[PDB]
């Protein structure tokens, strides 16, 4: 296999090819312009791996050209989803706590360096300097114990075979205290909706049906038309004004010509989940939010009572099955809380996702909103709903091709080596290379 190279190699190549004015490097001038056509892909792989405000330094695998023509970041950011949502919820908490507790927040100057100022050398200027502590909320050592060792690492439980597989970092298996702690760390970014009966008319198929017609929804998306002696007004009782969402709820019965219409899922059994406040109360007790029973009936029915002198006695080696085990532990109510929880938190185990594919704010623009809000954010929620519905509509399935693997084809050649560099050094390289 082609192996890793010392990280000083690409550093000296980039540094000797300074601005390509030496006569000694006049044969590599042609290759840098050739590498110009792959600068957008290098930019994409660069910014895809940006290091995540709870990280001081990220070391990325770098695929570089042997003349220093271009530096790629040969890595995909797999970020296991409960950990990523918990870390950004922790970021949300620390940022609100920092913004309220700071006398003056000085905003950065946005062209940070000057125009005639040459870019800094990475080597001295940043290899010497200490990295200035990241955000990293202080975790309770007793309450947040199964998370505290690994929570602000790069790819947290990567080198332990019990919680993930290997270093491809593709599958994860957690224990329920970990899921409970990660689920309560993410509450600032999550919702309180246990069932989707909230989304009766405000769901996806309803918005498809609204796109099919010219109808909009009061908090929903607005679209463009897709189609562009019987109904006598003396012969029709207008008893109730036909409210417009009837055309969504029952599309055939309320419209003429329902073409390209989608059917709607209209009811789920209302999930009644009693959220327990404090651990002093047991796992399952009769909560005072539930209406009592109070058995009452008219005449006692003759339900069978096999009386005495039935002489049926149980033998000695029989008991209730699991009376040896206790009725509940400290982790039972937490697991029942985990059963009604959003998609990453209702599960023990899953596949790792990319950092791109986790929308932290998606459940916020998917819900309709309390009217006291400004006009601005109402239009914004409506527009984000429009973008989501246009995503869900025009979803052609993945179209199974032959996989291409561009970077595996570059590093099979004799012109690319591979190393491991700090992300800031690669970003300074990519900027100098584009210049």
């Amino acid at each position: 296999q082609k192996e890793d190279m010392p990280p000083e190699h690409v550093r000296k190549i980039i540094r000797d090819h300074g601005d390509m004015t030496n006569r000694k490097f006049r044969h590599d001038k042609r290759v840098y312009l050739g590498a110009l056509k792959y600068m957008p892909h290098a930019v994409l792989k660069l910014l895809e791996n940006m290091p995540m405000p709870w990280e001081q330094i990220r070391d990325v695998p770098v695929l570089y050209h042997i003349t220093g023509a271009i530096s790629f970041v040969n890595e995909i950011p797999w970020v296991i989803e409960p950990v990523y949502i918990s870390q950004w919820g922790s970021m949300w908490i620390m940022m609100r706590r920092e913004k309220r507790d700071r006398r003056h927040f000085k905003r950065m100057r946005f062209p940070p360096f000057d125009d005639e100022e040459p870019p800094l050398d990475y080597a001295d200027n940043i290899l010497d300097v200490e990295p200035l502590e990241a955000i990293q909320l202080e975790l309770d050592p007793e309450e947040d114990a199964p998370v505290l060792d690994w929570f602000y690492d790069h790819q947290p439980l990567r080198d332990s075979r019990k919680y993930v597989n290997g270093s491809t970092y593709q599958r994860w298996q957690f224990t329920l205290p970990m899921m409970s702690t990660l689920y309560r760390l993410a509450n600032q970014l999550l919702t309180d909706l246990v069932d989707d009966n909230y989304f009766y008319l405000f769901d996806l198929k309803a918005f498809f049906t609204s796109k099919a017609l010219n109808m909009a929804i009061p908090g929903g998306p607005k679209f463009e038309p897709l189609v562009r002696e019987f109904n006598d007004i003396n012969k029709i009782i207008i008893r109730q004004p036909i409210r417009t969402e009837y055309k969504i709820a029952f599309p055939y019965l309320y419209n003429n010509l329902p073409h390209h219409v989608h059917l709607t899922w209209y009811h789920t059994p209302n999930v009644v989940f009693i959220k327990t406040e404090d651990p002093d109360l047991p796992a399952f007790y009769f909560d005072p939010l539930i209406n009592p029973i109070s058995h009452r009936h008219s005449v006692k029915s003759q339900e069978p009572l096999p009386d005495d002198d039935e002489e049926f006695e149980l033998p000695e080696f029989v008991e209730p099955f699991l009376k040896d085990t206790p009725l509940y532990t400290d982790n039972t109510a937490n697991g029942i809380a985990l059963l009604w929880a959003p998609r990453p938190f209702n599960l023990r185990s899953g596949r790792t996702r990319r950092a791109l594919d986790i929308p932290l704010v998606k459940n916020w623009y998917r819900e309709h909103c309390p009217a006291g809000q400004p006009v601005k954010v109402r239009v914004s929620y409506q527009k984000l709903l429009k973008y989501y519905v246009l995503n869900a509509l025009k979803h052609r399935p993945p179209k199974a091709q032959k996989k291409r693997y561009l970077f595996r084809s570059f590093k099979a050649t004799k012109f690319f080596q591979s190393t491991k560099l700090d992300w800031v050094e690669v970003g300074l390289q990519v900027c100098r290379q584009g210049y």
Partner: protein
């Protein structure tokens, strides 16, 4: 005579007040408002008209954010409170006629429909 429907609504406690409002806005007369035993939801059993029962379900789930849930069955027939034969009452073209002459309005509309 007018048909009425029997409606059961399953709803939370403030949603019961919401159902009371919406169902009262359709000539309702709520029959029963008992809570459900062993559950934090309430059952609202009520009558409703059948000309007033076009979209009550959808309006209810709109106004309760999908918490209440309504089902409706036919069981009933009672008198429309208007005088069905009256020539003093002049009916407007489109405007919804009040309770004193709904029977005259309905008879005129069904007369113009087929029978003439």
């Amino acid at each position: 005579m007018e048909p009425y429907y029997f409606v059961e609504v399953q709803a939370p406690a403030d949603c019961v007040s919401a159902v009371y409002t919406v169902l009262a806005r359709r000539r309702g007369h709520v029959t029963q408002d008992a809570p459900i035993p062993g559950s934090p939801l309430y059952t609202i059993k009520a009558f409703i008209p059948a000309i007033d029962s076009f979209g009550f379900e959808t309006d209810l789930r709109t106004h309760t954010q999908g918490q209440a849930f309504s089902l409706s069955v036919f069981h009933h027939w009672q008198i429309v409170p208007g005088d069905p034969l009256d020539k003093s009452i002049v009916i407007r073209p489109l405007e919804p006629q009040p309770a004193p002459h709904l029977a005259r309005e309905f008879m005129i509309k069904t007369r113009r429909r087929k029978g003439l």
